[PDB]
Design a protein around this ligand. Structure first.
Ligand code: HEM
Ligand SMILES: *[C@@H]1O[C@H](CO)[C@@H](O[C@@H]2O[C@H](CO)[C@@H](O[C@@H]3O[C@H](CO)[C@@H](O)[C@H](O)[C@@H]3O)[C@H](O)[C@H]2NC(C)=O)[C@H](O)[C@H]1NC(C)=O
Ligand SMILES: *[C@H]1O[C@H](CO)[C@@H](O)[C@H](O)[C@@H]1O[C@H]1O[C@H](CO)[C@@H](O)[C@H](O)[C@@H]1O
Ligand SMILES: *[C@@H]1O[C@H](CO)[C@@H](O)[C@H](O)[C@H]1NC(C)=O
Ligand SMILES: *[C@@H]1O[C@H](CO)[C@@H](O)[C@H](O)[C@H]1NC(C)=O
Ligand SMILES: *[C@H]1O[C@H](CO)[C@@H](O)[C@H](O)[C@@H]1O
Ligand SMILES: *[C@H]1O[C@H](CO)[C@@H](O)[C@H](O)[C@@H]1O
Ligand SMILES: *[C@H]1O[C@H](CO)[C@@H](O)[C@H](O)[C@@H]1O
Ligand SMILES: *[C@H]1O[C@H](CO)[C@@H](O)[C@H](O)[C@@H]1O
Ligand SMILES: *[C@H]1O[C@H](CO)[C@@H](O)[C@H](O)[C@@H]1O
Ligand SMILES: *[C@H]1O[C@H](CO)[C@@H](O)[C@H](O)[C@@H]1O
Ligand SMILES: *[C@H]1O[C@H](CO)[C@@H](O)[C@H](O)[C@@H]1O
Ligand SMILES: *[C@H]1O[C@H](CO)[C@@H](O)[C@H](O)[C@@H]1O
Ligand SMILES: *[C@H]1O[C@H](CO)[C@@H](O)[C@H](O)[C@@H]1O
Ligand SMILES: *[C@H]1O[C@H](CO)[C@@H](O)[C@H](O)[C@@H]1O
Ligand SMILES: [Br-]
Ligand SMILES: [Br-]
Ligand SMILES: [Br-]
Ligand SMILES: [Br-]
Ligand SMILES: [Br-]
Ligand SMILES: [Mn+2]
Length: 299
C-alpha cells in the first residue's frame, strides 16, 4: 500500500503500493513472488533478482523468515541455470523461467493448469504459469460454503487436484509431485492461517477469503484483516504443516489417483538436471493481473 496509508502498521512500516504488471513484465507461477513483484519489493519487472532481495522482501513484507525459502532459493537458481544454459550467479534472470515444467513448477497445482493439460496433441503446451480462475475454483469447491479449513481439508484439496490433473493431462505427461506441492501446502498455512484464533500455531486453519484474495489478486489481504505473521514464520512450521496434511485421514477418495497418492511424502530436496537435457519451452503469455475488479495502489 502507499507508504503513508499505514495499512501495514505496525507489522510492515515501509509499504509500497500495488502496481499491475505490464505486458513486458516477467511474472512467476508463484502467487507469493508475484505479489512481491507487484509491490516492487522485488523488481516490478521481475528480472535480475538477488537472493538477499528475495530474503528481505519475504521477511519484511510477508512475515516469512529466511529459513522458509532456503531450499526454494537453491532450486530457483538450479532452474535458472537449467533454462538459460549458464550459471546465473546471484541475479535470477527472471521470474518467468520458474515455470519450467517438471522442475520446480509441477503438475496438479492449486491454481494453475498443467503444461499439457487438455491438449489434443502431444507436442502442444499451454499456460502453466498464470493464475487460472477455473483451476482455483476446483480447489475452492472442495471447501465450498466454509470460511476456514484444516489439514484434512487441504489433503482433500490436493487429492482432488491430483485426480483432475491425472485425468485431464495428455497421456504420459502427468507426474506426481507431493514433496514440492506440500511444502506449498505448508506455505499456505504459514501465510494465511487464522492467527486470530488462540491455537493457530498448533492447529492452524486457513482463512479461505484471505487465500482467495492472495491468489486471485496477487496482492495482500490487508482489507480483510490480514497482516504479515509476527514473529515471522520459520521452516519448522512449514514442513510440520506439510507432514500434517499428508498424515491426515482421507474420508473421500477421488478416482484416478496416481500410485501412492494417499500417504506420507518424501522430504523436498534440491533439484538437478542432466547437462544433456534441453529445457521445455516456456509458455509466453503476458503476465496475469486482476481485472474483475482491477486493483488500486492500496489493494
Ligand atoms: C524464493 C522463494 C520462492 C520461489 C523461488 C518459489 C517458486 C515457486 C514455483 C516455481 C511455484 C510453482 C509450483 C507449481 O504450482 O507448479 C510456486 C508455487 C507456489 N508458491 Fe512459491 N516460491 C517461493 C516462495 C514462496 C513462499 C514464501 C510462499 C508462501 C509463504 C509461496 C507460496 C506458493 C504457493 C502457495 C504455490 C502453489 C500455487 C499453486 O499450486 O497454484 N512461495 N512457487
Ligand atoms: C525469462 O527468461 C527466459 C530464459 O532466458 C526466457 O525464455 C527464453 O526466451 C528466449 C527469447 O529471448 C528464447 O530464445 C529463442 O529460442 C528459439 C528456440 O530455441 C530460437 O530459435 C530463437 O532464436 C531464440 O534463441 C528461449 O527459447 C526461451 N527459453 C525457453 C526455455 O523457453 C523468457 O522469455 C523470459 N521471460 C520474460 C517475460 O522475460
Ligand atoms: C506467447 O507469445 C508467443 C510469441 O511471442 C506465441 O507464439 C505464444 O503462442 C504465446 O502467445 C500468447 O501470449 C502472447 C503474449 O506474449 C499473445 O500475444 C498471444 O495472443 C497469446 O495469448
Ligand atoms: C513499526 O513502528 C512502530 C512504532 O515505532 C514500532 O513500535 C514497531 O515495532 C514497528 N514495526 C516493525 C516491524 O519494525
Ligand atoms: C481483490 O481485491 C479487491 C480490492 O481490494 C477486492 O474488492 C476483491 O474482493 C479481491 N478479490 C478476492 C477474490 O478476494
Ligand atoms: C518439517 O520437516 C523437516 C524435515 O523435512 C524438519 O526438519 C522440521 O523440523 C519439520 O518437522
Ligand atoms: C508441527 O508444527 C505444526 C504447526 O505448528 C503443527 O500443526 C503440527 O502439529 C506439528 O507440531
Ligand atoms: C510429519 O509431521 C507431522 C506433523 O507433526 C505428523 O503428523 C506426521 O506424522 C509426520 O511425522
Ligand atoms: C471426510 O472428512 C474430511 C476431513 O474432515 C473432509 O475433507 C471430506 O470432505 C470428508 O467429509
Ligand atoms: C477413500 O479410499 C481410499 C482407498 O480406496 C482410502 O485410503 C481413503 O481413506 C478413503 O476411504
Ligand atoms: C469427497 O471429496 C473428494 C475430494 O474433494 C472428491 O473427489 C469426492 O468426489 C468426494 O466429494
Ligand atoms: C512437505 O514437507 C514434509 C516434511 O518434510 C514432506 O513429508 C512432504 O512430502 C512435503 O515436502
Ligand atoms: C544433479 O543430479 C543429476 C542426476 O539426476 C545430474 O545429472 C546433475 O549433473 C547433478 O549432479
Ligand atoms: C530440448 O530441445 C531438444 C532439441 O534440441 C529436444 O530434443 C528436447 O526434447 C527438448 O525439447
Ligand atoms: C483498475 O483500473 C480500472 C480502470 O479500468 C479502475 O476502474 C479501477 O479503480 C482500478 O484502478
Ligand atoms: Br529476461
Ligand atoms: Br482441460
Ligand atoms: Br476486501
Ligand atoms: Br512422495
Ligand atoms: Br523434491
Ligand atoms: Mn504447476
Amino acid at each position: 500500500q502507499e507508504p503513508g496509508s499505514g495499512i501495514g502498521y505496525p507489522y510492515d512500516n515501509n509499504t509500497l503500493p500495488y502496481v499491475a504488471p505490464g505486458p513486458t513484465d516477467s511474472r512467476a507461477p508463484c502467487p507469493a513472488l508475484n505479489a512481491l513483484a507487484n509491490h516492487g519489493y522485488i523488481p516490478h519487472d521481475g528480472r535480475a533478482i538477488s537472493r538477499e532481495t528475495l530474503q528481505n522482501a519475504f521477511l519484511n513484507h510477508m512475515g516469512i523468515a529466511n529459513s522458509v525459502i532456503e531450499l526454494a532459493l537453491t532450486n530457483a537458481f538450479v532452474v535458472c541455470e537449467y533454462v538459460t544454459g549458464s550459471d546465473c550467479g546471484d541475479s535470477l534472470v527472471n521470474l518467468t523461467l520458474l515455470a519450467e515444467p517438471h522442475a520446480f513448477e509441477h503438475d496438479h497445482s492449486f491454481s494453475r493448469k498443467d503444461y499439457k493439460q487438455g491438449v489434443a496433441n502431444s507436442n502442444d503446451f499451454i499456460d502453466n504459469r498464470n493464475f487460472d480462475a477455473e483451476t482455483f475454483q476446483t480447489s475452492l469447491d472442495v471447501v465450498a460454503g466454509k470460511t476456514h479449513f484444516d489439514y484434512a481439508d487441504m489433503n482433500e484439496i490436493r487429492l482432488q487436484r491430483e485426480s483432475l490433473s491425472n485425468e485431464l493431462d495428455f497421456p504420459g505427461w502427468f507426474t506426481e509431485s507431493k514433496p514440492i506441492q506440500n511444502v506449498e501446502s505448508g506455505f499456505i498455512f504459514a501465510l494465511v492461517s487464522d492467527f486470530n484464533l488462540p491455537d493457530n500455531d498448533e492447529n492452524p486453519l486457513v482463512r479461505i477469503d484471505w487465500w482467495k484474495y492472495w491468489f486471485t489478486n496477487e496482492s495482500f489481504p490487508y482489507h480483510l484483516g490480514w497482516h504479515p505473521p509476527s514473529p515471522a514464520r520459520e521452516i519448522e512450521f512449514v514442513t510440520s504443516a506439510s507432514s500434517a496434511v499428508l498424515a491426515a485421514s482421507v474420508t473421500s477418495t477421488p478416482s484416478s489417483l496416481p500410485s501412492g497418492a494417499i500417504g506420507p511424502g518424501a522430504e523436498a530436496v534440491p533439484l538437478s538436471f542432466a547437462s544433456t537435457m534441453t529445457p521445455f519451452l516456456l509458455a509466453t503469455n503476458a503476465p496475469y493481473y486482476a481485472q474483475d475488479p482491477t486493483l488500486g495502489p492500496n489493494d
